[PDB]
Design a protein around this ligand. Structure first.
Ligand SMILES: Nc1ncnc2c1ncn2[C@@H]1O[C@H](COP(=O)(O)OP(=O)(O)O)[C@@H](O)[C@H]1O
Ligand SMILES: Nc1ncnc2c1ncn2[C@@H]1O[C@H](COP(=O)(O)OP(=O)(O)O)[C@@H](O)[C@H]1O
Ligand SMILES: [Zn+2]
Ligand SMILES: [Zn+2]
Lengths: 242, 601, 431
């Protein structure tokens, strides 16, 4: 039942969940009662089980359910028993770029946004590797400012990652990949919502920069260090005896 | 059949609204007790859902190992509405059954009966292992450094995978024992009851598997009732079948018992103290010790002192004293010598009936022994070893060689064994109570000689015996009149023995009653008295060994009465015992000691 | 995350203290002078300091342990350089050691639950099999590419060699002379024979250990241990075993001739107060048998005896027996048995017997052979167990003649000899 609920709640990755666990139960039951249905490794035995249980209740969905040789076999058997940017004009899918975005373990909402961007504005293109590259980079720089604000060892590792995920030794093209999308995507309300959420504004806060730029000297350029820093740095030399 | 819909709703109806008498939902108690208990199992009486509807039992009988599928999940259902997060903790539930009327032997099994409910009788012997095997599986892959998800395992096969979620690669696979989850598996032997193997025939035997966290609920020598199922075993390597192609058969059994843990409650000890303190239990002790034979009271009394054990002490961890009591009986075999000791084995706590060679449990020593299973070297000890707190019985003490005698000598000497063999060196605690018997040379005792002169025993272990009791031919008419009447009526006040062992179990725990130096220099007096009176007409002496023993008897009777400390007018009993012990142990010359040493009576 | 736990752990190293004195900090500072690369630990000391590691080390220990190992090595690396800067390249992982006393659970009450967790227990020892080795760091060259690489392993003394770096499968030789290894052994256990059912033989269990948790133990030594109920490989089944992570022995059970010889200093001063009293002899006579009466003259010999005498050697080899020989003689009572019971207690490393040899006890060397390889080994002896000690006997009367002879030779030269078929012995009694 644990494994049943596991594989059944593996579909997302009201009446649905209930009726589907009941379905898989009595389905597996019917399939194992008689002596007719054998040599079926339990390795895989809760999948077109789940697909036909989708087919049964009320509404069914061909996509995102089967997601192979024996998949067809067992189906019939049960059903009877009952570089990257020089490349010109490439093509992509939903899950291709879900992969290239989920490699950073970023959320799926940002990915859906880049997907919407694409399927509306993937029309007039030369190469979508550039656009989606720049997109997910300017997702990373905006959401990952904290860890980077304290760890400048990150910005080399990250750019190195996407330099070789798309197979180049030259990188200034990637720099352009970022600034051009930033020129493009600059002013949409959803981009706006993300900037108020994760608070980069060029990577710097609002309540600081406005005094940086309106015309002030109270502007806190933190050359000096904060108090808790020293409060914890002192422990390193406390035990200096050893 | 896809009638799991009707079947499930109606069996859960049964499970929930069951009412039999006073509108009693008996199984609500079961499940709530289960959840209270972190329990993994639950029982369901077959007789009542069988009373209501028996095609329950039919769709069971066609494939009962598939009748399971609804019931285990239904247990979780009832469980979580009364115990959320139980399904979190206990991954799965097993069930148990009771009260099935059909009977088969271990031989009566026919092909028409298998793959159905089976109920047998027999005995559990040769218990092997509580080994673990799998129920949930995950992996360590090589082409990727990652895992598999969770997977339940069938009742009849291993598992192996060639697909991977990253690619269709049949890379090297290995299970992650360092993370997986397991359950309890036993292989058990089971044999028929020899009390009913009919004339001439032999008893067949079978093999049994025990699961569901019910392992080690059995021990060798128990009558058992496994109800279960039955089937073959396609265990591979089968194409090498000569003769006809015919296969073994094995039970999977669910329910289990032992019929066909002693301890004290508040009132159980309340009554103990009530009776212990009220007016001299001990007459009723010897009235209720062992009614096997009418026999005689004196040696019963001696061994009653041998029962309880006294108190040991050390003078700040030196000059130890033995608290536990010894005995030695002897006399003609015509009377009951090998009866009451086995009774005591039946009546004590952590007693033993060992023996010499022939019809013995063990050889009364310890040794580097093999084992039939897998050559497990082990260190068994003589039954002396087992009851280092308790007692060790023996019969036919005489019938022993050099070393099996030296061992018991060592025991009653320094209460510890030593071993110097086999890459192993050690001593133990042998502070056991000794009992024994033997056979005199010539049947009769040879009244006209002393002890060591009559029986060919040696003294140095003989000295440890505070008691050496003897009888002989009892020749008068009344002997016949009583013993023949009893032994024929065998085929024509005293308290339960359960209470008596529960009393000793209550006694060796609590009471270490003391002795007050109030008038004890009478010890010094009467000792010096009779130690001179001994030379006055006797040959051998009496020695402080006896005195120490009388003190141990005094504290013995203190534990018996359960009083707080020594009483004065029971030292009379102790010393009278040792007195009339030395009386019968000697020549007819002692017949003057009969008159001399009675004033101490 | 894991580094949060690492710091919660490493603060316990140098920021723990009780009785106003650092404990483990200077313990390490000592251990490193010892060149030990390990420590000792209590886990009772961690419960009050911090609860962020206990409830998770419990149920996922192996997930947490090598972390502690690496933390330890981290602390080592600073303090190594700092102490080199103070006074006066290759620093492997340090085996951790620990113990506990929370409880003891027996083999009988186990089940197939709480598996891979940690458990506490009692038992008795048998095995001293062999120093079986494992690897820790071993270099690899390919036979065709000549492509050097390297591997190191950590705990499990999971993966194998690389299947491909054409060279084909199995392209790799293992170099030894620049490889590294460690030792373990296979150690058994079995329960208290006094706490068992009346009927059946007992159940034992194996275990494994490593570098400095090795060779601590010799059989008969009752010991308590804590470990992890691990697994390796009827229908489908894996063998239950255990991984050690804590051993504790009684300090010295059955008397070891390799005993202590370097006593403390505080005791010297009272020792020499007792050296310089004139009442020395009379006190010893008042106290060797305090619950015992008379026979002052008899008690006045034992002190002549236990201290031995003139070990005197001469340039031929005809030594003189440094000790003395004695014989009580008399009746029941008269304390002839009680002193003898006592003397082992006062004794440091001596032995007691009855006559004829006792149960499973050779009164002299009862030699036999090996259960494995059927080879010769000097086994035992009540006269050589106690080398450099006294021996206590009762019932000297009923000897066997063969038993009496060698003992009859000891008391004037104290050296047994056995020259049976293949083995030729001169084993020193000195008792
Ligand atoms: N007083 C008695 N009442 C009933 N049965 C007796 C009595 N005395 C002896 N017997 C029977 O005779 C047997 C005597 O056996 P025992 O002398 O103990 O054999 P052994 O001497 O070999 O131990 C007992 O088993 C018992 O059943
Ligand atoms: N000289 C003595 N003084 C006091 N108590 C003794 C003396 N001799 C023996 N006992 C006591 O009498 C008991 C008998 O022991 P012991 O006489 O040593 O054995 P045995 O009688 O076999 O030689 C012991 O419990 C001991 O404490
Ligand atoms: Zn793979
Ligand atoms: Zn190669």
């Amino acid at each position: 039942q644990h494994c049943v609920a596991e594989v059944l709640r593996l579909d997302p990755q009201s009446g649905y969940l209930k009726k589907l666990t009941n379905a898989t139960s009595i389905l597996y039951n019917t399939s194992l009662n008689k002596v007719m249905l054998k040599q079926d490794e339990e390795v895989a035995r809760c999948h077109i089980c789940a697909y036909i249980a989708s087919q049964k209740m009320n509404e069914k969905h061909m996509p995102d359910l089967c997601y192979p040789k024996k998949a067809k076999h067992l189906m019939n058997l049960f059903r009877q028993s009952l570089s990257l940017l020089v490349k010109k004009y490439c093509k992509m899918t939903t899950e291709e770029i879900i992969r290239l975005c989920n490699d950073f373990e970023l959320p799926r909402e940002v990915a859906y946004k880049i997907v919407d961007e694409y399927n509306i504005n993937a029309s007039r293109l030369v190469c979508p590797w550039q656009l989606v590259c720049g997109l997910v980079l300017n997702c990373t720089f905006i959401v990952f400012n904290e860890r980077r604000r304290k760890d400048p060892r990150i910005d080399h590792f990250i750019v190195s990652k996407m330099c070789s995920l798309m197979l180049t030794s030259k990188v200034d093209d990637v720099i352009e990949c970022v600034k051009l999308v930033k020129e493009l995507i600059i002013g949409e309300k959803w981009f706006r919502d993300l900037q108020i959420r994760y608070d980069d504004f060029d990577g710097i806060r609002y309540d600081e920069i406005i005094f940086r730029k309106l015309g002030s000297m109270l502007q806190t350029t933190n050359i000096l260090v904060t108090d808790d820093q020293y409060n914890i740095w002192k422990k390193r030399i406390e035990m200096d005896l050893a | 059949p896809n009638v799991s819909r009707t079947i499930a709703r109606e069996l859960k109806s049964f499970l929930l609204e069951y009412t039999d008498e006073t509108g009693r939902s008996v199984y609500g108690a079961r499940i709530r007790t289960l959840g209270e208990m972190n329990s993994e199992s639950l029982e369901v009486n077959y007789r009542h859902l069988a009373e209501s509807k028996a095609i329950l039992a039919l769709f069971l009988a066609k494939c009962p190992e598939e009748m399971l599928k609804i019931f285990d999940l239904v247990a979780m259902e009832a469980t979580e509405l009364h115990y959320p997060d139980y399904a979190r903790i206990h991954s799965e539930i097993h069930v148990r059954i009771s009260d099935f009327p059909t009977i088969y032997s271990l031989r009566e099994l026919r092909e028409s009966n298998l793959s159905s409910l089976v109920r047998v009788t027999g005995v559990v012997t040769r218990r092997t292992g509580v080994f673990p095997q799998l129920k949930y599986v995950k992996f360590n892959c090589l082409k990727c450094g990652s895992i598999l998800g969770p997977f339940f395992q069938d009742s009849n096969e291993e598992i192996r995978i060639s697909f991977c979620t990253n690619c269709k690669s049949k890379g090297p696979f290995r299970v992650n024992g360092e993370k997986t989850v397991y359950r309890n598996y036993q292989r058990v032997t089971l044999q028929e009851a020899p009390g009913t193997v009919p004339p001439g025939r032999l008893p067949r035997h079978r093999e049994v598997i025990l699961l569901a966290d019910l392992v080690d609920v059995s021990k060798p020598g128990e009558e058992v009732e496994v109800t279960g199922i039955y089937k073959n075993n396609y265990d591979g390597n089968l194409n090498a079948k000569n003769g006809f192609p015919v296969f073994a058969t094995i039970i999977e059994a669910n329910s289990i018992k032992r019929r066909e843990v002693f301890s004290w409650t508040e009132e159980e000890e309340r009554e103990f103290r009530k009776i212990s303190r009220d007016r001299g239990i001990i007459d009723k002790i010897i009235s209720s010790m062992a009614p096997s034979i009418y026999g005689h009271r004196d040696i019963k009394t001696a061994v009653a002192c041998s029962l309880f054990g006294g108190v040991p002490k050390n003078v700040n961890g030196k000059h130890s004293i033995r608290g536990d009591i010894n005995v030695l009986l002897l006399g003609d075999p015509g009377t009951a010598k090998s009866q009451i000791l086995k009774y005591v084995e039946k009546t004590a706590h952590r007693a033993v009936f060992a023996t010499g060679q022939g019809a013995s449990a063990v050889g009364l020593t310890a040794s580097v022994r093999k084992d039939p299973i897998t050559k497990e070297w082990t260190l068994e000890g003589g039954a002396l070893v087992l009851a280092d707190k308790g007692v060790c019985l023996i019969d036919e003490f005489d019938k022993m060689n050099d070393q099996d005698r030296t061992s018991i000598h060592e025991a009653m000497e320094q209460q510890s064994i030593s071993i110097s063999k086999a890459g192993i060196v050690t001593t133990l605690q042998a502070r056991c109570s000794i009992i024994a018997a033997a056979n005199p040379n010539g049947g009769r005792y040879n009244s006209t000689l002393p002890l060591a002169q009559n029986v060919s025993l040696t003294e140095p272990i003989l000295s440890r015996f505070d008691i050496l009791c003897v009888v002989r031919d009892l020749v008068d008419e009344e002997a016949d009149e009583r013993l023949a009447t009893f032994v024929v009526d065998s085929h024509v006040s005293p308290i339960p023995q359960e209470l008596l062992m529960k009393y000793i179990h209550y006694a060796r725990t609590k009471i270490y009653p003391k002795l007050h130096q109030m008038d004890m220099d009478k010890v010094s007096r009467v000792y010096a008295d009779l130690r001179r009176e001994s030379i006055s007409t006797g040959s051998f002496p009496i020695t402080v060994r006896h005195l120490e023993s009388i003190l141990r008897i005094a504290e013995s009777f203190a534990k018996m009465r359960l009083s707080e400390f020594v009483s004065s007018y029971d030292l009379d009993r102790a010393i009278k015992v040792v007195v009339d012990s030395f009386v019968d142990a000697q020549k007819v010359s002692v017949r003057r000691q009969l008159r001399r040493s009675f004033a101490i009576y | 995350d894991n580094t949060e736990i690492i710091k919660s752990f490493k603060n316990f190293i140098l920021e723990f203290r009780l009785d106003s004195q650092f404990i483990y900090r200077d313990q390490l500072r000592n251990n490193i002078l010892v060149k030990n690369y390990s420590l000792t630990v209590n886990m009772e000391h961690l419960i009050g300091y911090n609860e962020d590691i206990y409830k998770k080390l419990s149920d996922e220990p192996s997930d947490i342990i090598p972390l502690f190992e690496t933390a330890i090595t981290q602390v080592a690396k600073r303090i190594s350089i700092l102490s080199r800067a103070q006074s006066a390249n290759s620093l492997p992982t340090f085996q951790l050691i620990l113990n506990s006393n929370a409880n003891q659970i027996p083999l009988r009450d186990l089940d197939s639950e709480h598996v891979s967790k940690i458990v506490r227990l009692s038992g008795i020892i048998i095995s001293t099999s062999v120093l079986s080795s494992r690897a820790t760091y071993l270099s690899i060259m390919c036979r065709n590419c000549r492509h050097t690489t390297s591997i190191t392993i950590n705990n499990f003394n999971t993966v194998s060699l690389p299947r491909s770096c054409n060279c084909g499968p199995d392209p790799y030789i293992i170099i030894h002379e620049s490889s590294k290894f460690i030792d373990q052994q296979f150690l058994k256990l079995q329960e208290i024979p006094e706490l068992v059912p009346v009927g059946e033989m007992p159940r034992n269990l194996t275990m494994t250990c490593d570098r400095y948790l090795t060779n601590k133990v010799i059989p008969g030594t009752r010991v308590t241990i804590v470990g992890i109920y691990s697994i390796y490989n009827g229908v489908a089944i894996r063998t239950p075993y255990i991984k050690i992570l804590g051993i504790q022995s009684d300090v010295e059970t059955s008397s070891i001739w390799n005993s202590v010889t370097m006593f403390t200093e505080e005791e010297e001063e009272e020792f020499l107060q007792l050296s310089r009293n004139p009442k020395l002899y009379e006190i010893l006579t008042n106290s060797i048998a305090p619950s015992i009466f008379g026979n002052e003259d008899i008690k006045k010999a034992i002190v002549c005896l236990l201290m031995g005498g003139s070990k005197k050697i001469l340039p031929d080899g005809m030594r003189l027996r440094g000790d003395i020989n004695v014989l009580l003689l008399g009746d029941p009572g008269t304390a002839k048995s009680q002193l003898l019971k006592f003397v082992e207690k006062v004794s440091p490393i001596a032995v007691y017997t009855s006559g004829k040899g006792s149960s499973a006890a050779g009164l002299t060397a009862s030699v036999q052979r090996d259960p494995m390889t059927r080879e010769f080994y000097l086994e035992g002896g009540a006269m050589v167990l106690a080398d450099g000690g006294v021996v206590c006997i009762d019932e000297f009367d009923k000897m066997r003649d063969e038993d009496r002879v060698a003992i009859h030779e000891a008391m004037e030269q104290q050296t047994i000899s056995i020259a049976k078929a293949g083995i030729t012995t001169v084993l020193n009694s000195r008792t």
